[PDB]
Amino acid sequence: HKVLGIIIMVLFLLSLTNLYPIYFIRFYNNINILQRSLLLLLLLDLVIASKLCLLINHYESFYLLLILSILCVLSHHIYNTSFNFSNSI
């Protein structure tokens, strides 16, 4: 879907930034081996996605791997949010 693609592009570019939260208290903790390994995975997924995106013009079966790589890219954690852990009222 073209409109969905435009929305996803805008959201991707906007989510690379760090403009939210604005007034909620937030702070950054340390980084670890798991995060670094996932960073390597991000690099791999981006490169494979580029190559496949150009290949799919002749080979239709690569759509599966292109979509898989894009999905893996869109769900990569840059900032580990301390809000992952809390309680309920």
Partner: protein, 228 residues
């Protein structure tokens, strides 16, 4: 745990709270960037079980534990009359109501009979994942790596450092400077100076937790609904 016998007599668990950690929500709100869009929602999460989990301190169970230990201290003070002493214990004393222990400070001498297979995996993971990072070879404690930042500073953390006694503050700074000097050459201390897991004491988490509670105090007893 060194605190376990006390926890034994208050009807609580002798096992670390590092276990029992669980996911209760689907979405992680408020959504925080710079995560990638789907990751910004928090549906799929990546954790190494070494997160802080500070916001789980806002619970009734933790307050009940703290007040049980405090009531034990006050009862002893009433019996003996050493109130002063009993309210000036170092937070690393197992009798201090805010005593905190890292999961690896007891992973080698744990009961391990009541643990689920998942919890046994968690224990082995805690030990080995500590080994991987090699802050024990830098002559450093884990709480030495809890440092504030110039921008978006962790407010509690700064206070947690100012509450430390002067000598412990100076020792922390000296350890950090030695680790800096070592890191210049990516060098480690001699193998006989490696930090034993039971020596990796959490000397700053009690102060951190006390500061968190003191900061939430005024929120729960507001002067008025629209008050600063």
């Amino acid at each position: 745990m060194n605190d376990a016998p006390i926890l034994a007599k208050l009807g609580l668990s002798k096992v670390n709270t590092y276990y029992f950690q669980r996911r209760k929500h689907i979405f992680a709100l408020p959504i925080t960037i710079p995560n990638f869009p789907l990751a910004a929602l928090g549906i799929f999460r990546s954790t190494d079980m070494f997160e802080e989990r500070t916001l789980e301190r806002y619970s009734r169970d933790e307050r009940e534990k703290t007040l049980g230990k405090a009531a034990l201290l006050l009862k002893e003070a009433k019996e003996k009359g050493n109130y002063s002493e009993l309210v000036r214990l170092d937070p690393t004393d197992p009798r201090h109501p805010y005593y905190f222990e890292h999961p690896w400070q007891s992973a080698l001498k744990m009961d391990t009979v009541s643990l689920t297979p998942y919890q046994q995996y968690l224990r082995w993971h805690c030990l080995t994942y500590r080994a991987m990072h090699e802050w024990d070879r830098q002559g450093l404690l884990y709480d030495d790596l809890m440092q504030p930042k110039a921008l978006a500073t962790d407010p509690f953390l700064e206070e947690a450092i100012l509450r430390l006694p002067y000598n412990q503050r100076v020792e922390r700074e000296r350890r950090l400077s030695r680790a800096y000097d070592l890191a210049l050459r990516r060098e480690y201390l001699p193998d006989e100076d490696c930090i034993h897991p039971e020596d990796d004491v959490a000397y700053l988490h009690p102060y951190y937790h006390m500061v968190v509670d003191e900061h939430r105090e005024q929120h729960e007893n507001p002067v008025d609904v629209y008050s600063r």
